[PDB]
Amino acid sequence: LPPAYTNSFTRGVYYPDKVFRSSVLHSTQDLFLPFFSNVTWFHAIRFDNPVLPFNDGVYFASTEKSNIIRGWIFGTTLDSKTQSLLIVNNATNVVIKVCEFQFCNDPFLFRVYSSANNCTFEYVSQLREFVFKNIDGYFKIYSKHTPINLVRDLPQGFSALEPLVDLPIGINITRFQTLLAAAYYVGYLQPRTFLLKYNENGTITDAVDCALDPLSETKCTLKSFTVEKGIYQTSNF
C-alpha cells in the first residue's frame, strides 16, 4: 500500500532551554518542525512497520485508544555488530537498554532480539507528541499528551512540549523503527529560527516562522506579532 501524506498545522514547538521568561518575546535558533510540513502518514492495521530514516530529529505524533504502540529502537545496522538503543514501555516500566542486539526481521510484541552479547548502559523505572534529538552525545525526549476526539486527521492547534529526560548515550544514529486500530505520523526536523511568545505565567502561546513567507519574515524582524501599514526592509539577495 502506497504511503499517504498530510499537512501539520503549527505543531512541534518545544521549550528550547531550561530558562524561565514571562511576557517577553524571544528569538531562538534550534531544530524545529517547519509549519505546514509534508509529514508522512502510516497505518499499522496489512502491516506497516518500515524502518524510517532518523536524519537530525523526528517529531512522532501518535493517536491511541488501547495503547497499541510499545516503543522504538535506535541504531545503525541492528545486527549486534554495532551499538543499539532500546526504549520499551510494557505494562509496568519504561525499560532502557544500550546493548548489541541481533534484532529480528519484524520485532513486535517478546520477539525482539536473538541475543545480547555486550552491554554498556541500562535503566529500569518503577494524542501524544514526541520529539527526539541527538546532539553532543545526548538523547533528549520532549513530550506532552493532550486528548482529542474532534477529527480523525491531525487537529489544528498550538501546544508546547516540555522536557522529560536526557540520556547520556552518545551513539551513532541514522535509522529507527517503531515497536508495535493504530496510526502514527512521522515528521523530520531541520535547522530554522523561530520567534516565541511567552505569556504572563510563562507558557508558550504562539510562534512565527522567521523564514516561511515574507509577512512572517517582517514579523520576525520587527519582533512583534502586529505590523502596521508601511514598507519595511528585510535583507539582501
Partner 1 sequence: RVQPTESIVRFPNITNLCPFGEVFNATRFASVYAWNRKRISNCVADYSVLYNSASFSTFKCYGVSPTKLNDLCFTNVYADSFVIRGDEVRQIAPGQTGKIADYNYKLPDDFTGCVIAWNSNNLDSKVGGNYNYLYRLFRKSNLKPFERDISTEIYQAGSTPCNGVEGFNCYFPLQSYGFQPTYGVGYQPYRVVVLSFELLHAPATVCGPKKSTNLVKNKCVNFNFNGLTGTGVLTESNKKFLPFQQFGRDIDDTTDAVRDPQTLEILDITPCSFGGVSVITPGTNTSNQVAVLYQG
Ligand X SMILES: *[C@@H]1O[C@H](CO)[C@@H](O)[C@H](O)[C@H]1NC(C)=O
> Which residues would be at the binding site for partner 1 (CB under 8 A)?
15, 18-22, 24, 162-163, 168, 201-202
Buried b / exposed e across 133-161, counting CB within 10 Å, b at 16+? bbeeeebbebbeeeeeeeeeebeeeebeb
**Binders of ligand X among 32-51, rule CB under 6 A?**
38
CB of 146 to partner 1, least distance (A): 17
Judged by CB under 6 A, the stretch of 25-33, 53-61, 132-140, 193-201 that binds ligand X is: 193-201
**Binders of ligand X among 51-90, rule CB under 6 A?**
76, 90
What are residue 65's DSSP bridge partners? none
Which partner from the list ligand X, partner 1, none does 22 bind, CB cut-off 5 to 8 Å by kind?
partner 1
Look at the block and give the residue holding cell 524502518: 51
Which partner from the list ligand X, partner 1, none does 20 bind, CB cut-off 5 to 8 Å by kind?
partner 1
Residues 6+ apart with CB under 8 A from 25: 195, 196, 197, 198, 223, 224
**Binders of ligand X among 88-147, rule CB under 6 A?**
90-93, 95, 117-118
CB of 53 to partner 1, least distance (A): 22
Alpha-helical regions (H) of 25-184: none
Nearest to ligand X of 40, 221 (CB atom) = 40
Residue 197: burial class (beta carbons within 10 Å; 0-12, 13-18, 19+): middle
Nearest to ligand X of 177, 220 (CB atom) = 177
Half-sphere exposure of 47 (CA within 13 A, CB side): 9
